[PDB]
Symmetry: D2
């Protein structure tokens, strides 16, 4: 049974602790947070073997097989490296690193230590996205894909740390674009990126970008748009569409649950908006890919099944994003090398 430690007992510590507690092949062994009280609380909610106040002792404890890192972005690099050196397998929430060189360093490392390194690209394990991908891959029906667009918009992360560059490593392009890039590439069966073009906005007053458009040109001729926002009210939106020479496919995560409700007051267990017509969620964690993702990882560790979707994909997406940042700065379409296309 894969013995698991959660590192950072906030929102995603919580989600991963739920999924782990429910997996018959794993045991939620430990929870650690800089804030010992948040660690104890989460340890009790999901019946963890214990709360570990010490990172040092955590890493030394040979009873742990795997660490799930759900701390702020800027910590991911250092914490994952220490972890892999200590001999633990590691699942890191996105973004795996804050730059391509950070990511590449972790990949090098995991391999040196013969450990599983996985990253939190949960959507790529969302069952409705898995289906979407099979439909685009049905060449008789869909023909050849030529457009893919992934939209990811919300009213922005609440946590204080997501507003500082050192702790967040970036604004909306990094926070949400990682997911969108990775979804475009994967929806097209790991398509090779030839060029990248991006423009960023700062919508909210005085700074990290809170909105972005990034466009990729792929080898096979197709074009990928990633449209990403921290400044969209009205409820999170996660949608994709793919268009081929014969077909079309659309995916809708948050308004594709087939539930609607209306109240004046607001329903007790419905996030936002509260009042009026809403689209309540059912099994949002599963729908979003977290159970399958973590299940894949538990399986990789439990018995050396390499990962369907590996950290090389995180390197690729990191390069895209870094090239996007630079495309914006220079107002130009760019190769991943960084050089202008012309």
């Amino acid at each position: 049974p894969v013995r698991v430690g959660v590192v950072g007992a906030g929102f995603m510590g919580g989600v991963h602790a739920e999924v782990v507690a429910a997996h018959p092949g794993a045991r939620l062994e430990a929870v650690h947070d800089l804030d010992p009280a948040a660690a104890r609380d989460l340890a009790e909610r999901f019946r963890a073997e214990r709360a570990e106040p010490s990172w040092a002792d955590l890493l030394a404890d040979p009873a742990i097989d795997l660490l799930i890192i759900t701390t702020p972005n800027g910590l991911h690099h250092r914490q994952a490296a220490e972890a892999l050196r200590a001999g633990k397998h590691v699942l890191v929430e996105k973004p795996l690193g804050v730059t391509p060189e950070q990511v590449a360093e972790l990949v090098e490392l995991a391999g040196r230590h013969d450990r599983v390194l996985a990253h939190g690209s949960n959507f790529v394990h969302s069952p409705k996205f898995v289906r979407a991908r099979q439909l685009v891959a049905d060449t008789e029906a869909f023909g050849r894909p030529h457009l893919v667009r992934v939209v990811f918009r919300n009213s922005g992360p609440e946590a204080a740390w997501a507003a500082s560059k050192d702790l967040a490593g970036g604004g909306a392009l990094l926070d949400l674009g990682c997911h969108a890039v990775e979804l475009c590439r994967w929806l097209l069966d790991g398509a090779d990126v030839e060029s990248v073009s991006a423009r960023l906005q700062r919508v909210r007053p005085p700074a990290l970008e809170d909105q972005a458009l990034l466009v990729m040109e792929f080898a096979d001729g197709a074009v990928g748009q990633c449209d990403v926002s921290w400044v969209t009210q009205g409820g999170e939106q996660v949608t994709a569409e793919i268009i081929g020479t014969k077909g079309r496919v659309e995916v809708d995560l948050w308004t594709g649950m087939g539930l609607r409700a209306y109240s004046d007051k607001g329903y007790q267990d419905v996030w936002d908006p509260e009042q009026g017509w809403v689209h309540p969620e059912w099994e949002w964690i599963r729908a979003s890919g977290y159970y399958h993702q973590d299940g894949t990882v538990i399986e990789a560790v439990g018995q050396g099944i390499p990962l369907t979707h590996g950290p090389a994909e995180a390197l690729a997406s990191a390069r895209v994003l870094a090239t996007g940042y630079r495309s914006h700065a220079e107002g130009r379409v760019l190769r991943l090398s960084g050089a202008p296309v012309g």
Copy 2:
């Protein structure tokens, strides 16, 4: 670990066999069918310990804890009774019985043998329906429920046995109305039915009803409509709405997956319609409540946890349907006793 036998290796044998193979607390031990080849097919598909050609030997085998009965409706009664007598726990696909007295007999028989009897009201375990129910139960927001309507329509069951009365026990009202009634009652927290009114149609030519409307009046004042059809082209529809003094809630199972696709041809693993704009399914079996239902039953048998939604609910719905059949015959709104309002 709960050792399981599937009886009837057709479409729902297939579904239950999938759910059982995937449950860590159970083992798919056997598959049996009148057609030994269909049983072997399914046994291999889901890695069943074995294919049992013999009903007799199936029921005698003390390695089996639980039977799932997925045969034609007319057989359910007889098969479930023999099964409970043989000492096995049993989950029967709907409709549990073909009449209220058949259903009552099974419930009481299960009790005699101290067995868990469950029935296949899978939608009552559908996670999106469970969530719809919580929202209607949120009184501050929803207020008091006064209308519930469940719609269940398809182009009708293809199997020959579903067209004959003896093997099917009834037409669309029994086939689909069982689900719809049971959902109206449950969405309103086991609401008491005071009257029943129904009209049936024969749309497709020379006979079992193809289409029906059944309406219930509940104790609290609310009205429930069940609108049910074997003659709707264009893709199955499963749908509910509940309306209160303050709120509204709507549930859409098959066109509420958040997936759409278009092709001229038709996509490989997408049902009907094939061509043009479709609404592909993801995790249909889960979404429909089968995993949670069978899970509930596995749990009841395995670690003696009583069933959340028991077979008395099948008796209640059976009475509603039998009163609906009679309402139609007499052109009158009726009490469950059978007497006219």
Copy 3:
């Protein structure tokens, strides 16, 4: 140019006055209301030739060709009869009469005086409903219709007069069922009703019914449901569906405008709900059939074109409703004669 008088300058006086003011073949000549100030206001809004304080003088004035009666239901009968006797053509808002015998009396009368009598079944002139009907009539595609359902729900009429039986003539079955029955019959090309079955509710506390289901059996085998409510929050709903042996057709009036908006506050020109996700309206009057309806009537009067959809249809629907009331009272399915089917 057809010279028009509006009688009752409230909400529907307002709508009809707009449509009339915009019709090149008519002239908004006069507005009359028991409340002379409401008449003057509406006369000014839509540039009416004058405000007429006297019903007597209104009816005697030979400059008026047509009267549009937008007063409370209970007045329709008497006002339309006086009008037709005075020699005026008449368009009466629904329900044309409060009972079948009232309606039959008006039909008799209009014919005696060789006048056009029309009733406010506007939806039957809604362009999206006209299309729906053509699609069901396309027998190759649709086959034979076997189900039609029309749903009509709102949070109920606000006017004081709609709560008293003498002034309203009935509750939700009469107010909304008239529209629904008439839509079912017309969507099926004037289908003959064989039986009627209905059950009514009183949802709001202490009385007129505020919710109803009525079901019709038609000659050709099809079944019609009319589901009608004064107790549905969240915005008016007007939907229909028709199902045949080959086809299906769905119509959505209020959430089929293809406009959506979100705000916290509420948009200035959007009715209800105010806040959160709404479905704003564009050209609601036209979409609802009022321009076409009134246009048909203006044409019938302007040049004796008999009406596509005549007051005989109002008699038929009145009989259905009266039979529905009785079906409810007796708990039985009934023939229009009133006799039980068995």
Copy 4:
């Protein structure tokens, strides 16, 4: 009464002829086409005073007040100029010109002859778009707009002339982008474009672009996307969304009619797709803005009311598109001057 001539009796000649025949303040006086038979067809369909075989005689006839030009794009410039010189008011289908200089020339020429020149930006007169614009303009509710995206996709124009550069003047970016740009600018109350960035595709084989993305940066900080395609199967899509600091607004023209239908075959007067689930149209011409646009123009000519949306807006959009073509060539974000940001 405004006496009107239609030039080019194909699809849009047909549409404009319908709108004109129905306007009480105008008279459909003439129809002309290179193909005299197509002109006669259309003249009879909409009861035109006559079919004019001769362009020369058409322009000389002093009974005509206004010409509507619905010929292939390459002809617009020449035909509109001859028309304005002949003393006629003119409405030209998009794209008004094939380049900014062509457009500028016409505007100035119209002025010399004191004529109304309008262009076919019909969607800017679409009642549901007019309403979308009012909601974005409601500052308390919407806040400040920061994103606008207009999507315009179809399976591409069937006419041969639209595949050749000389007759079409451009591919999808010019054909559909003109509409999309003009809608982004107008939905934001005539927002000033500061930069333009675009990438084009050739999806269908050996050439004019089939597909494009064009992005504008506006003065106020907002960003506009125009996503345009000749290679999308499954039915035309026209769609916009605008996102502010507080609100959101979404507009859907072709799948926002509130009509759906299913058949195995296909419904008589329903376009593409034919079979399976479709979204039948009602009043498409009105919904698309043609009646209000032509009404505006009839009014301008008839009773000297200036145009709400004038041809300067066609110049602005033409500059955006020409800068987009150049952006694509150079792989760079560009100012309208042509210079790199």
